[PDB]
Amino acid sequence: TYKLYIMTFQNAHFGSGTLDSSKLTFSADRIFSALVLEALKMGKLDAFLAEANQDKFTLTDAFPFQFGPFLPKPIGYPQFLALENVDDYLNGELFENEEHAVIDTVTKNQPHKDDNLYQVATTRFSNDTSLYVIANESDLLNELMSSLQYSGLGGKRSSGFGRFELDIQNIPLELSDRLTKNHSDKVMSLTTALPVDADLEEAMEDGHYLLTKSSGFAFSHATNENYRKQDLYKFASGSTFSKTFEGQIVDVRPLDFPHAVLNYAKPLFFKL
């Protein structure tokens, strides 16, 4: 709400459902699960969840940062837009997407083995592009993300991916004025949110979203076996709505599991 972070990667894998395909942003439950796995170690996640369950805790997925903050294309009412261009895009002439990251793909190996060729895609950022989560300024979050500097984000992360440099900044105005979370007019979820149920019936009627399917494993220390998550369909970073809704933190534990698998989907919005 109050303080945009800055992640400067220069090497990152961000998943997309495979290893052969990566994506240049990372869909806010990834950064929230990174913080949960960073507060599970240095054991602190009870404080981070008593903070996180509050309505003070907002969090927001990454958008590019090339000399200024970007926002998604709002889906409907005629790919990213700088904040200077969003009002001109709601008139809409041409805002063709420049290069933020080049998505390379490299074949790798496990030498002297039998089915050993895997292929890792990689967003290689173009020497100025950063990714900027927007979250509420809090010291616990700063101790968490200043060590996610050195643990990394997203992909392989122990083979040298997703490792950044955090450069916490104030939010520039005309982007702080339009983060609302309780509005009643033409609004845009710049997170990937999942509404509460009756609130979701309120959400579907004139919401212009994508769906995008957050899924596809639980990272644990208590199974010695990899169990699939509960395959959560969500909304997109575009996803215009009317009458701003209220999201969840959807427990997607693979049933009969020792702990919770949280999958942050509650929205910070953008007025338009």
């Binding site: 240095m42 490299v106 290689r124 060590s147 643990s151 040298g160 644990s220 208590a222």
Partner: protein, 207 residues
């Protein structure tokens, strides 16, 4: 407590690195087997997976029959040891300006090779691209102190340095049984970042 202590080296080339490539096209008179590069910089890269697996196959000959490889490089099974506390990073060719001040045109060279048949004695030439000699790359390696680590921190440092004395004896790269590797770790130090730890005795140990 919690810490993330990073290691640091300029990793110098004593012969030429050949690493990698995805086999685009042969291009009849051009480089068969080009070296891996950076898409933005077009400079040679030592990727972090290539360092990580290489020094965990070097430690799978010393520290094998294991728990200590498993907790330093993860294991897909074995619920404790997933992302085992070592966070590699790609290496990024620091001394490019020095290579243009020593005077060289490209940062990679083309080595001409061939293969002479045992019966016909007919040649078969190759043009392997190498990352040229006396280049330094930036090597940093995050080791991650937690409480379960704080049981057993120091014997993970008699491995890492032991895992860096072996890349200086094996080759780190592609066809390095005939030259082509021979990497070195000049100016090898350690420091602590996010947390708080004492790396005085560690930095005396890294000699």
């Amino acid at each position: 407590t919690f810490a993330k202590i990073k290691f640091s080296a300029q990793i110098r080339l004593e012969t030429g690195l050949h690493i990698g490539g995805s086999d685009a096209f042969a291009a009849i008179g051009a480089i068969n087997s080009p070296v891996i590069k950076d898409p933005i910089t077009n400079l040679p890269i030592i990727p972090g997976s290539s360092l990580k697996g290489k020094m965990r196959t070097l430690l799978a000959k010393v520290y094998n029959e294991s728990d200590i490889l498993s907790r330093l490089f993860g294991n897909s099974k074995d619920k404790r040891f997933k992302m085992g506390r070592l966070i590699f990073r790609d290496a990024f060719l620091s001394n490019a300006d020095e290579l243009d001040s020593l005077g060289v045109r490209s940062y990679t060279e083309v080595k001409f090779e061939n293969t002479i048949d045992r019966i016909t004695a007919e040649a078969n030439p190759r043009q392997i691209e190498r990352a040229i000699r006396n280049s330094t790359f930036d090597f940093e390696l995050i080791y991650e102190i937690t409480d379960e680590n704080e049981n057993q921190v120091e014997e993970d440092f008699k491995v890492i340095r032991d895992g860096l004395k072996l890349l200086e004896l094996d080759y780190l790269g592609g066809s390095g049984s005939r030259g082509y590797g021979k990497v070195a770790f000049e100016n090898l130090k350690a420091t602590t970042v996010f947390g708080n730890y004492d790396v005085k005795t560690l930095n005396e140990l890294l000699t």
